[PDB]
Design a protein around this nucleic acid. Structure first.
Ligand SMILES: Nc1ncnc2c1ncn2[C@@H]1O[C@H](CSCC[C@H](N)C(=O)O)[C@@H](O)[C@H]1O
Ligand SMILES: Nc1ncnc2c1ncn2[C@@H]1O[C@H](CSCC[C@H](N)C(=O)O)[C@@H](O)[C@H]1O
Lengths: 122, 375, 227, 375, 227, 122
RNA sequence: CCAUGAGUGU
RNA sequence: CCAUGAGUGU
RNA sequence: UGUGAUGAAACACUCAUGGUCUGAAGACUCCC
RNA sequence: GGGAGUCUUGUGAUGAAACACUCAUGGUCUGAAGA
């Protein structure tokens, strides 16, 4: 895919999915591309998760632009089916956002700091 | 570890302490600096930076921009970025001075004289890259069309009120504004009406007789040619406007298929243009959620509901879509929501340069519409 | 008529033909006006009439601005220069020694900003997005005053981002808070408190809070010192 | 004493009890009755009434209309009137019946058939005399004029926003809309501008070079011939409308000096017409107090003051008068109050058919104005 | 769909495809509508949908008009017939036997009144000023009902004046009170009261007073009997 | 004069000027053509008095028209200076109106009923 | 700007 | 519809 | 059916009629 | 400060919120159920 800016190791990708699940239970998340869009526009999201297997590509391509504008960090997962079914859906999702980490605070803070390292940030 | 700076002044290397390890001064030339400033936007390093990264041989280098990092990794170095680092600050604290020290200019006097004309020239360049965008011509065109639409209606309502001083029955006899105007333009006085001239407009033989009888028995006022010609000025302007609208329509169609084929595929050229006009640009249209695109053009209705906690509008300019306003009130909500959803997909494939996919989108849409209508 | 200095540098008041009092600045480019403002000569020196209804800075001054960090030879970063109405007056103040870098990302409007910046060596126009200071990083220096008048929901966050880039320690930031462009639903007075708090968390030292009403509706301007 | 009734039915005489002393039935002819009803409005007695006043030879007659009274006095009788007399009611109480008794029709069926078509023809006639009033065309003219005024501005504002994609520097260089319009029309691309074609408009050479220099150094976008020709439609239409406007103003001047010279003498055709449009007719403007004429066109502002006891408008559409909007703020109130006074007199001498007296009216006004300005 | 008679002559209600209830009258000129109203056949008889929002009489009924003095074969004087919207429905009601005289002084509007009155033998158009009943004195007869819906400051006085000309003793008058066309300053509820008193001093016997809201804002209609 | 519809005898004319005078003292009047016009449009006036020497005449020609619409009775006097100097002005007046008669009700009632007789009203 | 009655355009 | 900045016509 | 289900006030105009400011003061000069 | 006149003025002195448009920026519904 071309809207995927960097490479996510599957250990990270899995630790991502887990952070989402804890946030459904203890915090507040958003599911779907349109609500993720509003979550970035509104500055509610702390972490934005976008799928790498979206068809067609352009559906979620605006999220990198939007997220850098509002300087909200974003991360990718390999499967959209997995991310949606993580979100508490039995259907896929192209992108989601965590608004309140809750009992994923430590978990998220490590992700947003690891994805910084692979982004070449000091 | 060497901290690297990029500026109009050139490229400077710093240690973590804030001392110039080495520098390579830029040429004092408007043309060349402007281009590297534009280029640096995309990640491309200054040519002065490359020379500098060769003189000093640093194991770990750190730059200001995150877009430069992959370019410089490709050049052989281990590279990262720190956005608002202490070093970058240290550099600019001494920017009145260090222009002279690394001899970019002789004194402070004509550093700013130059820096000014660069700034003038740098934005002058950006001013042009903005105007050259294709979607802007689309927006102005359709805005002007709606200006003509508005004018056609006003002049037509005026002409009917005006001409009916002479020939009142003609008003209720011709529904179409363009048709009505055409009668007043070509004939003038009501007693100048003749059958063949009317067959030429498309009038069926039956109506021609109803019109001709009405002019015969008209209880209107007898009026001078001066009076009539006044009216006919307005009548003729109406017809002019109708032609110009259609010419604008064809022009719009071309531009809309050029700049946004996918969106055009879904709702047609005009409404596509209209949505571009409300968003401001295509790239701004793309970044929108479906829930916004759905109500664009209904700002009075929308912000009332947000202020008072009342009911929101179902549809904005999206209402013009044939399927919606033809449909009953309860189906409109679902059709608009579905359209806006598909529109958002159309906009994004358009903006992020995707090739045409409108056919499947339309097919997907017409499916959902049919599902809605089967209840 | 009479013109006289005020407590703040290069800012003057006029005694008028009738006895009204209006603000003015020493015209850096005599015989030429940037908006419709009046030109006034007194003792053979020309001043530009500073309409407060248009310029928020003039409003805040007419509303009791304690101290003005904009004076002779001041280096200012100006986010949201727009048509150049206000920035032209700060051009008069800083007076050739001082420099003003005007950021503005709307091309339709930067168009006439160009015209102002041509006649005025004080001003360095920049057609750019104030959310990405990396794009004008390579033209500006660090500054004494960070003047922020941008219509944006995250305007306050933007200002802070720009500050830690270009605002000197012990430098000042004038932040115009546009309530209705932050949130049309919330009470303007709620927004002010929450925005100033944001500044106080990013170790800005709130000096003064002014309400621009009646010159500007639902607006406030903050003067604070960065640490 | 004989009570006289006049009706479609004919002309009937009654005693004070309400018994038919004598009658003369009208002819069952649409043409003659319609004309006699119209004539009766001016006071003219029915011809059937004249015959009846001969048949009976009455000492004291009393009619329904006070307008008839002097007419019948000229005819030789002593006459008075009672507006809603008991006798007049008696006749109309028995009017379904007594139509048949005096043999106007055989039965009720085709009395009403006649009266229905009398009414149709009676109002058809009145409908026509309303359309024949000359001030209507004056009104319609200024209304179209104001439509063109409005459209010109809209189109010009559009064209500038649009054409400035190609040649932005041109907008602030040419103040006047028609001038701007002509340039976009004749040339198109900025690189087609030439000294000789531009000298032809009247441009002093100093401005031409400034135009040409701006076109040479333009940071505008390079754009296709389709894009430019699209814009040129509006430019030509703007130019069209200015011509039509100048034609209409000349027509309006013609009709206005005709229908209301004194008002035209005071405020000119356009503003004069404008006031007629607001009043509704010339005769309605005539019946108005100056205090109304002064605020016509400021209804939003006016009733704002009346509901709340706030400040009233100094002036309505009257603001357009040169003396007012050019004068300082404190003089405007008095100028408007003075104008309105004279306008009201002007309207009345105009409507009640006076010959031109505008010269002294203007002189009186400018006297009053000159006094105001010397303080 | 279902149509059935109401408490009043020639006035019907409709059960609809969905279950809504709208008033209607029997079409005097079948297949022809004076405005945009629905034409409805039920058991092969055509009715005209009577929009209350347009017609004050339909409003007064839907607001509980106790009794209607306009029925089969009634003679009515209708001051201010205008475009013919309401009067066309009373045409349906009185039904050829009855007669309706429409006074209206606005030619721009009588223009379209004509069209309604050609198709309907019931209605006798008169372009005249209701302030001068002498001018149509010579065309009409006396009547049972005086329906007055005229926009005039002294509308009530006009009605009373017309009454003592043409209104049969013990006839009924429906007088529409336009508060805002009597005075936009005064309170509508004050106006209704002062005008009804005008009728009572002029010995009309106030029977019922209806408020037309929401069908017509700042409007009320009075039913009274002339003596 | 042409706006003068009927003929007023000096005996009647004098009872008018007196009737106006008592109405200044005990009732409410309006003085001037514009205020008289407003008084008739508003239907406040009980009696309208018009001068016979107005120049130009058309200034007040509309009052007969206005008075018949709103059915307010009108009367003529011979001098405009006389009507004004009655009204408590030292300048002329072209027309005036009595809104409230006061201590002239009986006097007014005779005028409005005598001008009826010369108007041929039964 | 209020009310009433009649209509128009995307 | 709200707020800010730049303008136009009668 | 999260690639958006459910709920849910699209925008621009014309004509006709009525409601249409205040009401007697302002400016100068000459005598001790 | 007292007195005294002159011109303008109910054919209107005094007081007093005329109307119509364009551009640019931001604030731009709901969210898991439906046959
Ligand atoms: N994110 C952003 N980056 C740069 N400019 C922005 C911006 N968001 C809004 N603006 C601009 O900020 C301006 C605010 S209007 C400010 C007016 C000006 N300061 C004066 O007083 O004269 C607008 O013109 C808008 O184009
Ligand atoms: N003085 C008057 N004499 C006769 N009609 C008048 C009048 N003043 C106003 N009108 C008319 O009265 C109408 C009031 S609207 C009422 C329309 C009609 N009653 C209906 O419901 O269908 C207006 O159209 C107006 O033209």
């Amino acid at each position: 895919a071309s809207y995927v800016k960097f490479e996510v190791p599957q250990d990270l990708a899995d630790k991502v999915l887990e952070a989402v699940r804890k946030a459904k239970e203890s915090g507040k998340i958003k599911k779907g591309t349109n609500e993720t869009t509003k979550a970035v526009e509104r500055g509610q999201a702390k972490l934005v998760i976008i799928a790498e297997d979206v068809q067609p590509e352009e559906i979620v391509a605006h999220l990198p632009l939007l997220c850098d504008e509002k300087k909200i960090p974003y991360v990718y997962v390999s499967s959209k089916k997995a991310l949606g079914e993580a979100c508490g859906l039995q259907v896929a999702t192209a992108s989601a956002a965590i608004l309140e980490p809750g009992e994923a605070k430590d978990l998220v803070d490590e992700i947003i700091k690891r994805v910084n390292e692979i982004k070449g940030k000091t | 570890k060497i901290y690297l700076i990029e500026h109009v002044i050139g490229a400077v290397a710093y240690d973590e302490n804030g001392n110039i390890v080495d520098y390579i001064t830029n040429p004092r030339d408007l043309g060349k600096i402007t281009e590297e400033l534009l280029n640096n936007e995309k990640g491309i390093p200054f040519s002065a930076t490359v020379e500098l990264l060769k003189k000093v041989n640093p194991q770990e280098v750190v730059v200001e921009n995150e877009a430069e990092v992959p370019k410089l990794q490709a050049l052989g170095y281990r590279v990262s970025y720190e956005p608002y680092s202490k070093v970058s600050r240290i550099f600019r604290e001494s920017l009145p001075k260090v222009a002279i020290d690394i001899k970019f200019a002789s004194n402070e006097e004509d550093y700013y004289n130059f820096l000014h004309e660069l700034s003038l020239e740098y934005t002058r360049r950006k001013l042009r890259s903005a105007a050259q965008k294709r979607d802007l011509l689309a927006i102005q065109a359709v805005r002007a069309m709606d200006d003509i639409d508005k004018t056609i209606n006003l002049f037509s309502e005026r002409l009917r009120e005006w001409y009916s001083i002479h020939f009142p029955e003609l008003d209720k006899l011709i529904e179409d504004h363009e048709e009505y105007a055409t009668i007043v333009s070509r004939f003038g006085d009501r007693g100048f009406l003749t059958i063949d001239s009317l067959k030429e407009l498309g009038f069926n033989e039956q109506r021609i007789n109803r019109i001709l009888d009405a002019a015969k028995k008209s209880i209107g006022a007898d009026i001078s040619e001066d009076d009539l010609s006044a009216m006919r000025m307005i009548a003729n302007t109406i017809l002019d406007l109708y032609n110009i609208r259609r010419n604008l329509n064809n022009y719009l169609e071309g531009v809309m298929k050029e700049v946004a084929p996918n969106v055009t595929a879904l709702v047609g050229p005009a409404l596509g243009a209209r949505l571009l006009s409300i968003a401001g640009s295509l790239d701004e249209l793309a970044k929108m959620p479906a829930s916004t695109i759905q109500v664009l053009g209904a700002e009075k209705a929308l912000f009332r509901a947000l202020r008072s906690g009342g009911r929101p509008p179902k549809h904005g300019i999206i209402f013009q879509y044939p399927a919606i306003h033809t449909s009953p009130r309860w189906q409109r909500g679902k059709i608009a929501r579905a359209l806006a959803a598909k529109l958002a997909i159309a906009a994004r494939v358009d903006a992020f340069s995707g090739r045409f996919i409108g056919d499947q989108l339309n097919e997907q849409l017409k499916k959902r519409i049919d599902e809605i209508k089967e209840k | 008529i009479t013109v006289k200095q005020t407590n703040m540098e290069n800012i003057y008041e006029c005694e008028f033909n009738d006895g009204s009092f209006r603000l003015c600045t020493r015209n850096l480019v005599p015989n030429f006006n940037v908006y419709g403002e009046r030109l006034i000569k007194y003792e053979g020196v020309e001043y530009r009439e500073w309409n407060a209804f248009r310029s928020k800075l003039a409003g805040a001054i007419l509303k009791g601005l304690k101290t003005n960090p904009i004076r002779k030879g001041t280096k200012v970063l100006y986010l949201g220069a727009a048509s150049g109405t206000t920035i032209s007056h700060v051009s008069d103040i800083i007076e050739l020694n001082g420099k003003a870098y005007g950021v503005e990302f709307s091309p339709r409007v930067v168009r006439e900003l160009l015209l102002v910046a041509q006649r005025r060596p004080n001003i360095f126009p920049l057609l750019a997005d104030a959310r990405f200071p990396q794009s004008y990083k390579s033209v500006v220096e660090n500054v004494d005053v960070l003047y922020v008048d941008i219509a944006q929901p995250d305007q306050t966050d933007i200002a802070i981002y720009n500050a830690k880039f270009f605002l000197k320690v012990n430098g000042d930031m004038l932040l115009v808070i546009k309530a209705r462009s932050i949130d049309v639903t919330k009470d303007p007075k709620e927004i002010y408190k929450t925005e100033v708090e944001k500044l106080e968390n990013s170790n800005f030292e709130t000096i003064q809070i002014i309400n621009l009403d009646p010159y500007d509706k639902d607006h406030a301007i903050v003067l604070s010192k960065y640490k």
